[PDB]
Structures are given as C-alpha cells and as structure tokens.
PDB file of C-alpha atoms in Angstrom:
ATOM      1  CA  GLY A   1      37.127 228.219 -38.947  1.00 39.91           C
ATOM      2  CA  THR A   2      38.499 231.703 -38.335  1.00 41.97           C
ATOM      3  CA  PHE A   3      38.740 232.964 -41.919  1.00 41.39           C
ATOM      4  CA  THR A   4      36.166 235.756 -41.764  1.00 38.54           C
ATOM      5  CA  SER A   5      37.279 236.948 -38.319  1.00 33.96           C
ATOM      6  CA  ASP A   6      40.966 236.902 -39.261  1.00 35.06           C
ATOM      7  CA  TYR A   7      40.156 238.671 -42.526  1.00 33.00           C
ATOM      8  CA  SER A   8      38.439 241.400 -40.482  1.00 35.45           C
ATOM      9  CA  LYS A   9      41.607 241.803 -38.404  1.00 35.60           C
ATOM     10  CA  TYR A  10      43.624 241.959 -41.609  1.00 36.96           C
ATOM     11  CA  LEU A  11      41.303 244.720 -42.832  1.00 36.60           C
ATOM     12  CA  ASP A  12      41.851 246.588 -39.570  1.00 36.23           C
ATOM     13  CA  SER A  13      45.602 246.213 -40.031  1.00 38.10           C
ATOM     14  CA  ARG A  14      45.371 247.704 -43.515  1.00 39.43           C
ATOM     15  CA  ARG A  15      43.366 250.605 -42.092  1.00 42.34           C
ATOM     16  CA  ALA A  16      45.869 251.135 -39.295  1.00 43.55           C
ATOM     17  CA  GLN A  17      48.717 251.116 -41.821  1.00 42.27           C
ATOM     18  CA  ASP A  18      46.818 253.636 -43.942  1.00 45.59           C
ATOM     19  CA  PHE A  19      46.442 255.809 -40.835  1.00 43.18           C
ATOM     20  CA  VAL A  20      50.187 255.497 -40.175  1.00 44.44           C
ATOM     21  CA  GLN A  21      50.853 256.757 -43.698  1.00 43.65           C
ATOM     22  CA  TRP A  22      48.435 259.656 -43.234  1.00 40.37           C
ATOM     23  CA  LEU A  23      50.039 260.606 -39.919  1.00 41.27           C
ATOM     24  CA  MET A  24      53.377 260.894 -41.708  1.00 39.21           C
ATOM     25  CA  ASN A  25      51.872 262.794 -44.630  1.00 37.67           C
ATOM     26  CA  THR A  26      52.966 259.949 -46.921  1.00 38.10           C
TER      27      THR A  26
END
C-alpha cells in the first residue's frame, strides 16, 4: 500500500500551503 508515502506527500502539501501563507504575510 501507499498510505505512508501518500501521507508524507500530504504533509509536504501542508508545509507548502503554510509557506504560501507566510509569503503573503497571512
């Protein structure tokens, strides 16, 4: 199964979204 690997990509997505918020100062 791909659960752990897909979860890691999900975590990276959350981090990228956090970075997007930071870049906007939001």
